[PDB]
């Protein structure tokens, strides 16, 4: 439930969290980079 | 010179030649394993993380 | 996949699920009973 | 008759095949052979003379 | 007469439907898909927000 003060204009309620998104830059080779990309709670697959 | 490497023929001038002793080149099957692993990719991409390797 | 054991879309590629002794009439005098649609063939796709 | 063509921007596009990246390099590694190559012909491969 | 007017561009489709197959490749997989064929997507499934 979200209750606020009256708004004059159609203003956005910018709702966030403290959600984690961590990336490891993997590299087994000199020349190419593996991008281990994952938003942790919001499944990328 | 007509008998040194010639390999004497059945008819002195034939029509359609076979494959024996007419130097049929066999370059050996160039064997490389895998650039990326299939078994390592299926497990991650279905459960969570996205990759580019 | 065991859930398609009844449905037979996963159980046998496309023909041998019923009694395979009635395949005679289809390939030999089929024109009267042109019947390959009553038993509808399963879909197949690699993965 | 007061007409001309103008150019502003040109781009080269391509519609690539999406697949698992294992056979994407394996199948072309078979295509990288002296005997296993590519060749193409047209219906009018015919020569012209006037 | 030369007037500095412009052309507006569109299309006309009206009888058929669009098709967007669930699989990784958009080709005709049918009922048995590829992306939703996986057991991880199947039993313990996600939702769908759009």
Residues belonging to chain B: 53
List CB contacts of C31: < 8 A, sequence separation 6 or more: none
Chains that touch B (3 or more CB pairs under 8 A): A, D, E
CA dihedral in degrees (C18, C23, C27, C28; nearest 10)?
A: -150
C-alpha distances in angstroms, B33 versus A26, B28, D29, D30? 21, 16, 11, 12
Structure tokens at D13: 């596009």
CA distance A26 to A28: 7
Per DSSP, D22 falls in state T
Q: How many contacts does B have with D, using Cβ atoms within 8 A?
A: 20
CA distance B47 to B42: 9
CB atoms within 10 A of CB A22: 9
CA distance A36 to B49: 7
CA distance B43 to B47: 7
Tokens 């395949």 correspond to: C23
Is residue C10 within 8 Å of residue C44, measured between CB atoms?
A: no
Three-state DSSP class for residue B50: strand
Q: Do E29 and C45 touch (CB under 8 A)?
A: yes
Which technique?
X-ray
Per CB-CB distance under 8 Å, the chain B contacts of A21 are none
Query: Phi and psi for C4 in degrees, rounded to 5?
Result: -100, 10
Chains B and A, touching by 3 or more CB pairs within 8 angstroms: yes
Query: Phi and psi for C2 in degrees, rounded to 5?
Result: -75, -20
Per CB-CB distance under 8 Å, the chain A contacts of B50 are 37-38, 44-45
Strand partners, A39: A21
CB atoms within 10 A of CB E16: 6
Q: Where are the beta strands (DSSP E) in B1-53?
A: none
CB atoms within 10 A of CB D50: 2
- DSSP symbols for A8-33: SS-----------EEEEEEEEETTEE
Per CB-CB distance under 8 Å, the chain B contacts of A35 are 51-53
Structure tokens at A2: 């979200």
Radius of gyration over every alpha carbon of chain E, rounded to an integer in angstroms: 21
CA distance D36 to B27: 12
Structure tokens at E10: 């569109």
Per CB-CB distance under 8 Å, the chain E contacts of C9 are 31-32
Q: Do A44 and B53 touch (CB under 8 A)?
A: no
List CB contacts of B30: < 8 A, sequence separation 6 or more: D29, D32, D33
Query: Phi and psi for B22 in degrees, rounded to 5?
Result: -110, 35
Alpha helices in chain E (DSSP H): 39-42
Per DSSP, A35 falls in state E
Nearest Cα neighbor of E42 from C43, B38, C41, C2 is C2
Chains that touch E (3 or more CB pairs under 8 A): B, C, D
Chain breaks of chain B after residues with C–N above 2.5 Å: none
C-alpha distances in angstroms, E19 versus A13, C31, D10, E34, E36? 36, 35, 31, 16, 16
Tokens 């048995």 correspond to: E32
């Amino acid at each position: 439930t979200f209750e606020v003060d009256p708004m004059d204009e159609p203003t956005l309620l910018y709702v966030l969290f403290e959600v984690f998104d961590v990336v490891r830059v993997h590299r087994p080779h000199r020349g190419v980079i593996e991008t281990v990309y994952l938003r942790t709670p919001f499944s990328a697959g | 010179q007509a008998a040194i490497t010639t390999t004497p023929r059945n008819n002195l001038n034939p029509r359609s030649w076979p494959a024996a002793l007419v130097y049929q080149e066999s370059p050996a099957p160039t064997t490389v394993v895998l650039p990326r692993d299939a078994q390592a990719e299926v497990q991650m991409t279905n459960s969570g993380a996205q990759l580019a390797g | 996949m065991p859930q398609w054991s009844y449905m037979h879309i996963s159980g046998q590629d496309a023909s041998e699920y019923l009694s395979p002794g009635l395949v005679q009439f289809a390939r030999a005098t089929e024109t009267y009973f042109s019947l390959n649609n009553k038993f509808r063939n399963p879909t197949v796709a690699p993965t | 008759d007061g007409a001309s063509i103008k150019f502003d921007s040109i781009c080269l596009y391509a519609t690539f095949f999406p697949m698992a990246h294992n056979t994407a390099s394996t199948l072309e590694a078979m295509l990288r052979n002296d005997t296993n190559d590519q060749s193409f012909n047209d219906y009018l491969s015919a020569a012209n003379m006037l | 007469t030369a007037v500095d007017s412009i052309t507006q561009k569109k299309f006309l489709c009206d009888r058929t439907l669009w098709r967007i197959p669930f699989s990784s490749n958009f080709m005709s997989m049918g009922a048995l898909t590829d992306l939703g064929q996986n057991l991880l997507y199947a039993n313990s499934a996600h939702a769908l927000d759009m």
